Design a protein around this ligand. Sequence first.
Ligand code: CLA
Ligand code: CLA
Ligand code: CLA
Ligand code: CLA
Ligand SMILES: CCCCCCCCCCCCCCCC(=O)OC[C@H](COP(=O)(O)OC[C@@H](O)CO)OC(=O)CCCCCCCCCCCCCCC
Ligand SMILES: CC1=C(/C=C/C(C)=C/C=C/C(C)=C/C=C/C=C(C)/C=C/C=C(C)/C=C/C2=C(C)CCCC2(C)C)C(C)(C)CCC1
Ligand SMILES: CC1=C(/C=C/C(C)=C/C=C/C(C)=C/C=C/C=C(C)/C=C/C=C(C)/C=C/C2=C(C)CCCC2(C)C)C(C)(C)CCC1
Ligand SMILES: [Fe+3]
Lengths: 483, 32, 337, 61, 28, 30, 60, 40, 21, 37, 29
Amino acid sequence: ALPWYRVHTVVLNDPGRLISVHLMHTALVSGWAGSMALYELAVFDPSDPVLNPMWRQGMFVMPFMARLGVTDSWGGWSITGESVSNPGLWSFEGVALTHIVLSGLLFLASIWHWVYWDLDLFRDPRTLEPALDLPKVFGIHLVLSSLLCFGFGAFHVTGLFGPGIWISDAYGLTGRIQSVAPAWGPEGFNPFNPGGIASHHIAAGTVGILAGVFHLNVRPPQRLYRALRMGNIETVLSSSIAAVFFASFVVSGTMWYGAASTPIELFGPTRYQWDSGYFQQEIEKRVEESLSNGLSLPEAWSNIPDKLAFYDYIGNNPAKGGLFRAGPMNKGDGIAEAWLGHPVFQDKEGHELIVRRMPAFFENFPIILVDKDGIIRADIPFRRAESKYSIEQVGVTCSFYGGKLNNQSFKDASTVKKYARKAQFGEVFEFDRTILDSDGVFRSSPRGWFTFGHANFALLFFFGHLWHGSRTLFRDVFAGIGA
Amino acid sequence: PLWLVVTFGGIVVLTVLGIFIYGSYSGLGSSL
Amino acid sequence: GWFDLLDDWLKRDRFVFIGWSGILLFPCAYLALGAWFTGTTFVSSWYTHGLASSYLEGCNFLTAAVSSPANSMGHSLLFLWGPEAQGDFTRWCQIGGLWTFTALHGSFGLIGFCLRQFEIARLVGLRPYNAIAFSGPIAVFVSVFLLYPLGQASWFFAPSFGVAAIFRFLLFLQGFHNWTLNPFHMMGVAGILGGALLCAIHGATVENTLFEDGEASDTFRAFQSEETYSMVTANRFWSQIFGVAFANKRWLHFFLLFVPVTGLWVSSIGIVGLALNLRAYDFVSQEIRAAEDPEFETFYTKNILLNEGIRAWMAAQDQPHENFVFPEEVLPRGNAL
Amino acid sequence: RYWVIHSITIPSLFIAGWLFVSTGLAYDVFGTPRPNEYFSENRQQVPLINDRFNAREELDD
Amino acid sequence: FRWLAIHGLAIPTVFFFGAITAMQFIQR
Amino acid sequence: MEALVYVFLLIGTLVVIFFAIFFRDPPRIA
Amino acid sequence: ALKTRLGELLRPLNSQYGKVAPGWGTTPIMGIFMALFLLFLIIILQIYNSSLILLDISWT
Amino acid sequence: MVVQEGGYLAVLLGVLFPVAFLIILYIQSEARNAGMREAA
Amino acid sequence: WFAVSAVALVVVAAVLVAVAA
Amino acid sequence: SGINPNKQPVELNRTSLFWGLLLIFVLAVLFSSYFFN
Amino acid sequence: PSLAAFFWSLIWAAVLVILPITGAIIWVS
Ligand code: CLA
Ligand code: CLA
Ligand code: CLA
Ligand code: CLA
Ligand SMILES: CCCCCCCCCCCCCCCC(=O)OC[C@H](COP(=O)(O)OC[C@@H](O)CO)OC(=O)CCCCCCCCCCCCCCC
Ligand SMILES: CC1=C(/C=C/C(C)=C/C=C/C(C)=C/C=C/C=C(C)/C=C/C=C(C)/C=C/C2=C(C)CCCC2(C)C)C(C)(C)CCC1
Ligand SMILES: CC1=C(/C=C/C(C)=C/C=C/C(C)=C/C=C/C=C(C)/C=C/C=C(C)/C=C/C2=C(C)CCCC2(C)C)C(C)(C)CCC1
Ligand SMILES: [Fe+3]
């Protein structure tokens, strides 16, 4: 009899029940989509798109609904900050419920195809045996897929007949759903250029369609048919698995490094932005530009939005979490209440001291205040005796510019040391850690979880590909050998 | 003779290795 | 036919089998191995890590290596004709092109070797279990030498091809990731130690349940379809000693295939995790308890302290490009030491 | 019989490697620092490469 | 392929052996 | 009281072992 | 087996089972497209990896 | 000790759902086995 | 509007009922 | 529809039962400590 | 320049992939 693993092989030579089983799987997946959407909607807080956006709240399917147009809720709110009164059918709730209904229909259909398995369509006229013409089937499915691809690229993305794609500025401050014109030049192959998306699908779609035609008319070469065992469906399984883990590695990559299809307002910022001080450099540039305009320093920093300052905080760095630290990021530091403003540190000579920022590698980091030439001017000593850089000895002051603590100065060693630790974490913010009983430890973003899940799934599917390919090519000997 | 060849070759190899070991005590990498 | 003649020639029974797979395998294998020797003998790591790295500089086999590229190179493929070296072989070696060379050629080499296992298996007419079992080691190489640095800042934090360098990678992952605490790694350890256990115990059992098929004390010479050892006696022995014994030879040999291979795969899952700094670093319950209660101590917290030490001190020397400056007053340490 | 050509080539290659090191050609080829070339009179620190696309001009200095 | 492989491994091995010995005598 | 769960799992494993030893189906010679 | 209207309509789409083209058929063309595909993937990889500079691969 | 409550569920559900699975299979397996051994 | 979606569902349903017999 | 010929019985010997129980319970031990955190 | 380096890489690769190919063909007849 069958061992427990091999149970599912009872569907290999039964096209009808294979279809039924696939219907069941599909029903389960769509059902999961709907349910997940409902749960997220049930736990989501739309009251602050700036300091409590979706990626701070652990939303995993929300940014995907947002990415393609669904940004409104029946509750009358939006994740862009706007206020709608009637989103129509395609709100978040609408997407969820439609997915549920779809799940139900696929469920019933699965039942039917399980019951009535012996359809004449699956029989071969010459042998009365179950048979599927996999090449021609591939032709049809490729035509469907390519047509849908072309359609999605030419109408949904371009806005010719669709909502468009989530587009934002280079610093994720003005994100919204917008129509995207296709970029046909080489710049379309820029992973951060939205236009590319459109063009891609269009182009790919078209080529696919052409291929479809070919695969619909020309029979496979006998030598390729023999080599790839095109009479066995498990070869289709092998190839499909290969394609799938390829795609998985790709989306993991684009998610981690960033792309035009993984906006930071939907999935959170990247670790490399903290690595290069992306947002930090931007804020300094804007402030200096404001100084060139005649404005003062606190007037310059006051013009800086809380959002931009929030991006320059290591608590939103996806490479600071833990595998078993469950929940949203708000479960760690809390729910972001205010930007305190930019702390400037100075010694008694007037040197502008900068607190050495914590790298993503370090769970903890010594507090060191360094000048413009990277020279140690202050720190917080482990051993107190024989130390020569303590803030109590060097005499350092901290003055906030912009934010809630604007134009406040601190000269006492206690408060300066305080804001120094906090400063090693980047910009400083206010936090509500009572609502969710935060445990005071950093958690990853949806970006991190996605990248993790899909990278590992890709690896495992590399194995799956090897195994099924093996079973395909070695079908004749997979029960043993002879003499 | 095969055995004489193996012996001579082995002695040669051990001599080169010995030179390397000596090299750990002299010149670069000797802490001197 | 042309292709048929090619196939006939490639699949000829030589002292060293070639095949199509050989077309991929032999060049890349050769270049990877050769690059390792070339690097460990001549090339330095002065402009990447600030370290002497070759025999030419005075390294021995233990301290010599082909080190990772400079952190500033990022995840650059570092082609010899790349925009970084611009054809200059010397500057290429100084940047760390030999590492990417060795890594990529080694990867395609592994692909070629697995394809070799598949090909020989199919030609001879065997089941392709050798290749699968080998999917194991591949997972290790891909996750540790490719995925982990790709998740990090640059190739710089990938393992350097060398003994003491690998040791450094180890202690690094301990101090920074608490890698020993990761359950996937624990499964890996289970896989390896279990594998060695199975190897030893199977070898010993077969060797000590042998049938007397000769008169000499040298039982090796006395060796057919008949089993050379008594499966029943073995079964009896381990049943009375350990409580449980094998009874099915096929299941046995599959089992000692399965254990180590699985070990490798699991640990690979772990390493991907670490590529994203998604660590199994802490137990929040004990950290909170210890934060509120200064009398509460476990071996876990002790190891956390150990990690902190590792990180400081080595942080300054292991990442020179960061220009980390830790005054001797901020370095964590205990009394006296 | 086959020891002749080997007695003419194996020592030749051995000496060739020896010369590859003794002449110091290896240093020039692989850019490996000589025992007196780690620190110059101008630089007292480790000469790390900081520019990815300008590593040539940086290594020249 | 026998010649190509055997020499492919052996020739550089001897080259390198000479080199490393020479290194044994390099003084500071 | 996670200690209860840990004790439960350990007792479970040990029980599984006990029955694996003293309640195995006997090997039978061909 | 059961004959249905949809099944009868879709019947010719599954009737050419096993039908192959003699020899290598269109294999060389397929190989050409495969080589081109490899070239493409390598190109976009190098663009993303900044080994091929044309177009800045930053947030635009 | 402040632990994650969901753990409880996870563990138990995890542990008990395959366990049941196994038991189901085993017993029916044996049933069939018996039948076949009986009519032989 | 709801027109396209409703019409689409009615069309699909019509196909279903038609090929059902 | 007609009786399906692709139906097959499923087997699970006592050794596999014990190996399964052992696998599940041991996995539980490990990850339990990580799930509680 | 990087594109030219890519094309040249394709050139050298083509040369040293024709070398083994043709090598195999000549020993084939
Ligand atoms: C693309 C998807 C896909 C599909 C359709 C199949 C299909 C199949 N696989 Mg397969 N496989 C895949 C991916 C896939 N595999 C991958 C990625 C791997 C690598 C891990 C494998 C490794 C693999 C092995 C090693 C074996 C199969 C076998 C089989 C056959 C029987 C499977 C069965 O009854 O399971 C039975 C499973 C159970 C009774 C329950 C076990 C469930 C485990 C413990 C966890 C499941 C995850 C959870 C329930 C849901 C999460 C889903 C996840 C994808 C997110 C069947 C043809 C078997 C075979 O060849 O039979 C002839 C076999 O021995 N597969
Ligand atoms: C195939 C890829 C693809 C994907 C993923 C999307 C995704 C999306 N599109 Mg889109 N689109 C595509 C291709 C695609 N499109 C193409 C090719 C075109 C060509 C013209 C368009 C044109 C288009 C327009 C014009 C619009 C969208 C919109 C949307 C969004 C809402 C639609 C939705 O969630 O449907 C999910 C649908 C399902 C899961 C199917 C469920 C089926 C059930 C049966 C529905 C019935 C529900 C009913 C109440 C109950 C019936 C009971 C039963 C007994 C009969 C969503 C982000 C809308 C949008 O963004 O608005 C803001 C919008 O206005 N698209
Ligand atoms: C793989 C896809 C995927 C990804 C990337 C995410 C990502 C996320 N989910 Mg989600 N989820 C998914 C699938 C996914 N989900 C599915 C399929 C379900 C249905 C069950 C859910 C149900 C769900 C809920 C109900 C919630 C989330 C939440 C979250 C967020 C935080 C989750 C967290 O802390 O991780 C925790 C992760 C772990 C602890 C990792 C588990 C350990 C690994 C897998 C090893 C296990 C192996 C081991 C052998 C098995 C157990 C042993 C057993 C025998 C005892 C995050 C954005 C939360 C959220 O959005 O906040 C509001 C939340 O409350 N998810
Ligand atoms: C890594 C090891 C590995 C191994 C052992 C196998 C083994 C197998 N694969 Mg396979 N595969 C792999 C990786 C692997 N695959 C990867 C990474 C992919 C991409 C997703 C695929 C995609 C794939 C498909 C689509 C199919 C197989 C199939 C098969 C089976 C038939 C043999 C075959 O076609 O090999 C193929 C192996 C190769 C072509 C080797 C790759 C050599 C490349 C071209 C080198 C070129 C690199 C370039 C010059 C330099 C890049 C530069 C860059 C760094 C910038 C066999 C079981 C077939 C099968 O199972 O059918 C029954 C099948 O249809 N595979
Ligand atoms: C005084 C003497 C004391 C002896 C020491 C006690 C030994 C206890 C051994 C228990 C073995 C249980 C086997 C169950 C599973 C079982 O019953 O398998 C039975 C199985 C019999 O195999 P067969 O050859 O009969 O299988 C044929 C087919 O059924 C295969 O499908 O034995 C093996 O597979 C050999 C491997 C056993 C080695 C397993 C070691 C596991 C060690 C325990 C790890 C967890 C410990 C956790 C502690 C908290
Ligand atoms: C029939 C019908 C209907 C209904 C439908 C429905 C109601 C559906 C639902 C559906 C659903 C509602 C679905 C769901 C799904 C879900 C899923 C698919 C999930 C999964 C998950 C998993 C599998 C995992 C798990 C776990 C965890 C993670 C933890 C613990 C452990 C375990 C493993 C358990 C209507 C009236 C409409 C119409 C038609 C008819
Ligand atoms: C990189 C590169 C390349 C490559 C090159 C090559 C390929 C090289 C090779 C090299 C080689 C190929 C080398 C070799 C070496 C070897 C050695 C170095 C050896 C050593 C040995 C020893 C040390 C011994 C040991 C022992 C044994 C074996 C056992 C017993 C004991 C004793 C100890 C005696 C080319 C140009 C293509 C391109 C560019 C880049
Ligand atoms: Fe054996």
